[model samples]
Target: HHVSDIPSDLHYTAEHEWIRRSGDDTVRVGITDYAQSALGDVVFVQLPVIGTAVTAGETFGEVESTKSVSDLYAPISGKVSEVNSDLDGTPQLVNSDPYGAGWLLDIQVDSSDVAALESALTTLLDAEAYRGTLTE
Candidate 1:
């Protein structure tokens, strides 16, 4: 299935990260299924350390592939709660499960920036809208 085949409960960014609110103050983030598909096979991953602060749209990490090296953007402003260390050993997990066990970070969002997060997510194309763009 295509990236857009993923469910919509998770909000997406135009830059291709998926953000899911975990509670009132935390969120889970990862590269979208769409992004991993475009990147082909992931050969390596460089993720931010836990406790690092990440700003929205900032490059939080890098993914190296046979095709190219791409920066991984932070989808929201927050302090990283955790990084997926498993990627250090099995980078291909990003290609195989970009949404689930493949998640890159968990974040404790900055209170003042919550609105921007909501706005960004809603303004981006939903799964259906993105599929429409793909066909166009």
Candidate 2:
């Protein structure tokens, strides 16, 4: 259950999305490896289009698998900048690389929400701490 590739600057949620800020005022969003592992092989993924508004902690889209279908939650309030087009025909990318090419979308975060992002990230455990929790 240990996932060692967790990035230091990325924040995690109990729902398993990782948020990383991009230079263009957007925050990159992706499902964590822990999530993809629990969901099994990804068969289909639905991502919101660019320019769509999203709210933090709200269900924005979903991922489907042979095992189950799960909601994709927004980690910050913003307008979506881009959706990962690669998943349209290759959903398995989520299983093979949930952190990179498997990323879901990017959002131009609202200024107010940026503070919440910083605060929420501080509340979550780091990679090592999270792994320890899994062991316990």
Candidate 3:
């Protein structure tokens, strides 16, 4: 099996998504490299509309692969700020660049302050902990 890239700075979900804080109130989201590898040769990506509302632990989009289709969950409650349209033409990017160009979307976090944002992130797994999940 191939090893996965688990970036230290991002928070991870139990469902295999990654969340990177982009600014004070926005976060960029994507499937983790481990997820793409497990899914295998992504064929299509379905993203939510910008301005749509998303809640933590709820399905926001989907990724279809040769193996299976997986739901992309929101890590924090927010409104969709941007969707990566690049995936429409090149779904392979999810496998080629899971952390960069393959990014799924950005959300304008619902938090009212930085403290609230931190609180929301506390529910997610960190790099070390996420790796532990893969090991087991």
Candidate 4:
């Protein structure tokens, strides 16, 4: 079915979260193509409100599907600047367009947190490493 679409432009986590650089201070966060495909028929979303703090390796929200409910982890620590309110009506956006329209939140970090940023970067897996972990 041509499933694995792990784009090289982003960093990933073993938990299946993807982080794409949005700006110098902002990063876009979402589940991978593989994640959505595995969690079929997404029926609900539980996202942190904008302005909430997200810590690396911590659960920020959740995605519930007909199959199971999975925790969404934060790959970086930052203040959420935006939330994808689109899921309020159409949670299947998680399945149809995971990286694009289905982005869960935008985290705008503090410029002063250089160490935190570096630590966060080291926590994520590159495309190659992430693919290696995918086993049926």
Candidate 5:
């Protein structure tokens, strides 16, 4: 895959999740293109329930593909505020548009502010840094 698909604007976790701010205290997250491609044809996604509290690095849900099922981790500490319901009908979105329509959920940061959100985001890898971890 081209490095360009790894969006420079979003933060990334070592586990392959991408994160981006969507509001003052809300952020959206999704799997990276590399992850989707590795998982192979995502058929189902189980998202954390709206309003469920999540701690960074904790398992919050699951994603299933033709290859295998994997636990989805919380990229940061927050509560789930919204989920991409479109995934219920067409999980292929995760493969076709991992960064856009395939986004998993919106998280409302615990402290309810931009600073808190940035603080959480900084804990993850930047595009360049994350790109270095990729292997041929």
Candidate 6:
């Protein structure tokens, strides 16, 4: 397959999740195109619930594909404020628009979590760094 879109203005984890700023302190999260392409056809996704606390480098939820099931990891620490429920019914969206409609979570933006989130984000790879992780 051709190279999947990997935008420069985003953060990524070695586990393959992408982080994009959504609100002032909130960020949307999802699996990168590099990840979904590696997984084959996505058949299902397990979304994290709202109001849940997530830690950087910790488990968030999961996604299942024809080839394998992979755990989703959190790239920052914060409470989960939203989940893209659309993926539960149309898992293929993970392949169709992973950077958009396939977004998995929205971190609750707040004062207490901002510093920690920023620090955790520093631990994540930038899009360029993430690009190096993929098998070109």
Work out the TM-score per prediction.
0.81, 0.82, 0.93, 0.92, 0.92, 0.91
lDDT of 6 by residue, 67-86 (tens): 89999877788888999989
Candidate structures ordered by TM-score, highest first: 3, 5, 4, 6, 2, 1
Q: Write the per-residue lDDT of candidate 4 for residues 1-136, one digit (tens) a residue.
A: 6758888888899988888889878889989889988888789889888998877777889999988999998788888889899988999998899899988888888857533455567778998888888863
lDDT of 3 at 90: 93
- For lDDT, candidate 3 versus 4, the one ahead is 3
Residue pairs in clash, model 6 = none
Better model by lDDT: candidate 2 vs candidate 6: 6
lDDT of 5 by residue, 44-120 (tens): 99998999988888898878898888788889898989999999999989889999999999888867532388688
Provide the lowest-lDDT 10-residue window in model 2. 127-136
Error of 3 at 49 (Å): 0.5
Using TM-score as the measure, name the better of candidate 1 and candidate 6.
6
* lDDT by residue for model 3 (39-92), tens: 988899999999988888889889999789999898888888999999999998
**Tens-digit per-residue lDDT, 1-136, candidate 1:** 4334455777767667777777776778777777787887889888888988887788989888899788988777778888888888888888889988788888776667454455545554565555555522
lDDT of 3 at 75: 82
The regions of model 3 sitting more than 4 angstroms off are 112-115
Off by over 4 Å in 5: 1-4, 112-115
Model 1 local distance difference test score: 0.75
Off by over 4 Å in 4: 113-119
CA lDDT scores, all candidates in order: 0.75, 0.77, 0.87, 0.84, 0.86, 0.83
TM-score of candidate 2 on Cα atoms, chains taken together: 0.82
Model number with the top lDDT: 3
Candidate 5 clashing pairs, residues 3+ apart or interchain = none
lDDT tens string, model 2, 1-136? 4544666667776677777767546678888777788788999998888888887787889998999889998777778889999999988888789888999898786566554455545655566665544422
TM-score-best of 2 and 3: 3
Backbone atom clashes (below 3 Å) for every candidate: 0, 0, 0, 0, 0, 0
Worst 10 contiguous positions by lDDT, candidate 1: 127-136
